[PDB]
DNA sequence: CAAGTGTGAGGAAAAGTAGTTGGGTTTTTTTTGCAGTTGAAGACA
């Protein structure tokens, strides 16, 4: 559902997981890495789930001999994907993007699709209200501060935006027209995007993620 | 191509502390009336 919720891809990736993903067994949380150097044993189950997820997509889309997934179909999904508001979720992912990290969302900062800009300032006026409460900077200082905020009344000197499954539905429809070198390029293009998404919620390692990817790649070819 | 021991530093923050200054009393070490009086210069016998 996260994106190209290809209903079939749930069972695809569940199957490869079925496959060599811990001898077709639900990944359990790794162990009590007692040692202090915390090596990348890479046993964090999810990290591998996302890896199988990614792999599945391109393997699945990189050998859909029957041509079940049309050339022009793959980019359409990536297309429709091209960001968009979020019945709360995508707005959230913007808020996480804004921890100014490795610059994958930094520019989103820059762009920040109009309103996204607006509902952002809304969430700032509500949820960094706690912000704080100076005590011991002479009462006078406090008064001054109040006055300043004063002379800045501000805060106002379809309910419009939509929910999660609404957005999900509507891009599922935005692709609803379903029934060589370029597609390979498109596939790579799409995979980078998900790499962005899944990686962005998590500790990424614009390499480790990759390292993780590499790992099971190796794991797999022992058929 | 690959997994596995051993292990040093980089990093964060509130409060404190630094440096520089200034402030700061405290401190500490013009005549305008009266009547008289003395001393005075000058004269004299």
Tokens of A170: 């509507």
- By what technique were these coordinates determined? cryo-EM
* CB contact at 8 A, A5 and A169: no
**DSSP secondary structure code for residue A131 in this structure:** T
Give, in order, the Cα–Cα distances in Å from A137 to each of A134, A141, A144.
Answer: 5, 6, 11
Q: Does nucleic acid strand B have an atom less than 7 angstroms from the CB of A35?
A: yes
Chain A 51-110 contacts with nucleic strand B (CB below 7 A): none
Estimate in Å the CA A195 to C1' B45 gap, whole number.
150
Tokens of A68: 């079940």
Estimate in Å the CA A109 to C1' B34 gap, whole number.
105
Tokens of A197: 């998404």
Rounded Cα gap, residues A38 and A18, in angstroms: 28
**Of A179, A194, A151, nearest in space to A2 by CA:** A194
Rounded Cα gap, residues A159 and A145, in angstroms: 35
Chain A 100-129 contacts with nucleic strand B (CB below 7 A): none
Estimate in Å the CA A32 to C1' B42 gap, whole number.
136
Estimate in Å the CA A170 to C1' B38 gap, whole number.
132
* CB contact at 8 A, A25 and A64: no
Rounded Cα gap, residues A32 and A161, in angstroms: 44
Rounded Cα gap, residues A54 and A192, in angstroms: 10
Tokens of A139: 């009462």
User: Left (φ > 0), alpha (ψ -120 to 50) or beta: where does A186 sit?
Assistant: alpha
Q: Which residue is nearest to nucleotide B8 (CA to C1')?
A: A37
Breaks in chain A after (C-N > 2.5 angstroms): 133, 157, 158, 179
**Of A85, A89, A76, nearest in space to A172 by CA:** A76
**C-alpha triplet A98, A44, A108: angle, nearest 5°:** 15
* CB contact at 8 A, A73 and A187: no
Three-class DSSP labels, A17-48: HHHHCCCCCCCCCCCCCCCCCCCCCCCCHHHH
**DSSP secondary structure code for residue A121 in this structure:** H
Estimate in Å the CA A147 to C1' B25 gap, whole number.
35
Estimate in Å the CA A49 to C1' B18 gap, whole number.
54
Q: Does nucleic acid strand B have an atom less than 7 angstroms from the CB of A222?
A: no
């Amino acid at each position: 559902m996260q994106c190209a919720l290809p209903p079939e891809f749930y069972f695809y990736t569940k199957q490869v997981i079925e496959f060599e993903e811990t001898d077709i067994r639900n990944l359990t949380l790794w162990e009590r890495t007692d040692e202090r150097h915390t090596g990348r044993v890479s046993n964090h189950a999810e990290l591998r789930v996302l890896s199988y997820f990614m792999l599945t997509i391109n393997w699945m889309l990189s050998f859909d001999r029957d041509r079940q997934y049309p050339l022009k179909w793959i980019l359409s999904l990536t297309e429709s994907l091209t960001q968009r508001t979020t019945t709360s979720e995508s707005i959230g992912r913007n808020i996480v993007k804004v921890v100014y990290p490795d610059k994958p969302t930094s520019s989103d900062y820059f762009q920040w699709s109009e309103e996204e800009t607006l509902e952002f300032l809304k969430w700032m006026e509500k949820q960094f209200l706690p912000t704080q409460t100076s005590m011991e900077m002479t009462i006078d200082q406090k008064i001054a501060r109040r006055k300043l905020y004063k002379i800045f009344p501000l805060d106002r000197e379809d309910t419009h935006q939509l929910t999660f499954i609404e957005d999900l539905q509507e891009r599922y429809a935005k692709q609803t027209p379903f029934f060589p070198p370029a597609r390979k390029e498109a596939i790579g293009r799409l995979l980078t995007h998900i790499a962005s998404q899944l990686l962005v919620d998590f500790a990424i390692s614009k390499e480790q993620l990759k390292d993780c990817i590499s790992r099971i790649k190796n794991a797999c070819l022992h058929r």
